[model samples]
Target: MSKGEELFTGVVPILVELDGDVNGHKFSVRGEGEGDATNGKLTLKFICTTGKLPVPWPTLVTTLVQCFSRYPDHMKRHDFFKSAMPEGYVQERTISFKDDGTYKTRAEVKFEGDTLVNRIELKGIDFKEDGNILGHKLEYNLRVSTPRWERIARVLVCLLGILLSLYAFHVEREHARDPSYKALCDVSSSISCSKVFGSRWGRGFGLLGSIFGNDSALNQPNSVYGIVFYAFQLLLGMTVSAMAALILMTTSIMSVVGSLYLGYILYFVLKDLSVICVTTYALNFILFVLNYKRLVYLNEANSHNVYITADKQKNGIKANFKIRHNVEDGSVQLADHYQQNTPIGDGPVLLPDNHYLSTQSVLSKDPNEKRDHMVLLEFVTAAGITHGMDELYK
Candidate 1:
């Protein structure tokens, strides 16, 4: 027999026989409709030849109806399958009997314009036995489309966290500097003023001055000399303040650098900032206390004798062994005209060409009378000489 004839005789006739047995004495046919049948192809039709089978027809009908009742649920599952598949593609399915009295199903699916095939094989089906139409575990293989948006959203959230971390660091640094101006000055004089003014006071006064104008008596000079003197003092203060500010700024920048270069250096940066700020402020407070005592002593002395001098001038007589000693030394000989100059003049009197003459002259006359007729000649020469020697050793 040909392939078509074999299929008609074997598969179609068996299905017809089963349908007749289940539905009770019906004239059964298979394939399409008999009116349009071709060679080896039959149209299936079943009718009640008698009334119904002698067996429990109600039970059979109920079981068949219950089985078909799952059609809507299966249709919902098929819809989910279509959603997971590529658009504009349909799934084709078929069920067939196997030689082992089991059923096997084939599903043809398409995705991305490519056809994918899947199969499910079931193990036990025996219509000869009641309540055993199909059985055993069914094994299935399915194809689905990939999800893309979820992965992209995950990456975006990570990037946003990194940016927020950077912004937090910047804001923290700005606030850190905002609360302390004492940390901005390195010089003794400016540090003294910063300690007295305090950061809170400075910010408050600065704000007030901006609003009402800088007309405070403390800020305004009384004379030209006062103006020039305050100007020089402010210049020195600014220089030291700038140095201190640079030191602090560099340290903060170094912290950021370490965090960028090393994987776990951020912990150290936080720890060090806390330690450094505390240590710096504590040491500065101690120094300020010491300086306060010195300033008090200076104010009470009245003579302003920063340096003690020993002169060997014979009164109206010729003298020999002319010796000079600084204030630190006590065992020295002196004449009647010997005078200890102020600290402002002491440095310059010893070193004639010192650049601090301008600073010294603000407070005392030139101690050396032999050189320029400037006010603190002798004091200028002595201070300059002492400082010059000290610098050479350093």
Candidate 2:
């Protein structure tokens, strides 16, 4: 091939895979180059077909700049348009001709921490007189690895479970007191029952009283009796609701019994719904366990003597502490130091001017001189401090 002859042709697609926290996010681009005699150099373009890159605008602009930067006067003549360039980012680099009817191109990428990296060398160029250019067809393949949707689904399920459990507990409280009162009044005199169970007024009153009233007259005066009545009332309500739901499901199944096609569809729908509900309830139960566990931990910590130590380092900050009474029972106290700026990070951290003092030491010292025993730590940054006292205490 002649030196000025079109040496690059066709499409060189580059696939880039980004490993993200969430799965299935990927991106790709195709690089194409064609010789332009009018411009006296080869014009290259890139197109993006997948996920977005880190620095989209900068990369794209830089790519175009570099392409034109090589032939400034030609760029002025052609007026390199951003729309003419293919989609995707362009790193800074140059393209040159090789000995054997081929061309070479290189791109330099600057990463975090002031590091520059070179990638994707395109070699060999085949070009037609008509403007179609080809060489080493650069195809980029990137498999973006991220967290599975199932994992996110599971986390959402857990969060929902906890919320549902709390809601169920709230419902249980309401069902217990009011339902029992209605049942008791239904068995007793109609006049007394009618006052609280006969009309909408009566039902409304029962619900209101169960939820907010401290009056013993609303139900049985005995504490144990009230608790037992509430328990039975909750069970009865759940049983009735379940029975109604089952009947509805049975009717649906029976409707599709004669047709095999409809039966399959109905079966799948019902099966999926059942799975969803069961999964929901299971998550709720787990949330209940986790919440209850937290309460238990807090109670245990309250009874132990705990002290925390703040250790600041270059990479990150860490806080350590110990529970002298029971190594297994100390609480990690976190503080937020941000006054105007919103605090970032997880869990909890300590606020400014807060002191870490052992519970035993605090208790041993006189109340008037309590501040002397504790260590006063200043908040260096307006960020926050999270204490991993739980890990150490445990």
Residue 334, candidate 2: Cα error in Å is 39
* Every candidate's CA RMSD: 49.3, 27.7
How well does candidate 2 score on lDDT at residue 256? 28
Q: lDDT tens string, model 1, 191-224?
A: 2322322322223222444565666544321122
Clashes per candidate (backbone, < 3 Å): 34, 33
lDDT of 2 by residue, 311-355 (tens): 222111222232111111221211111111111222232222222
Off by over 4 Å in 2: 1-105, 108-146, 181-281, 284-394
Superposed Cα deviation of residue 106, candidate 1 (Å): 99
What are the TM-scores, per candidate, against the unseen true structure? 0.16, 0.18
Scored by lDDT, model 1 comes in at: 0.24
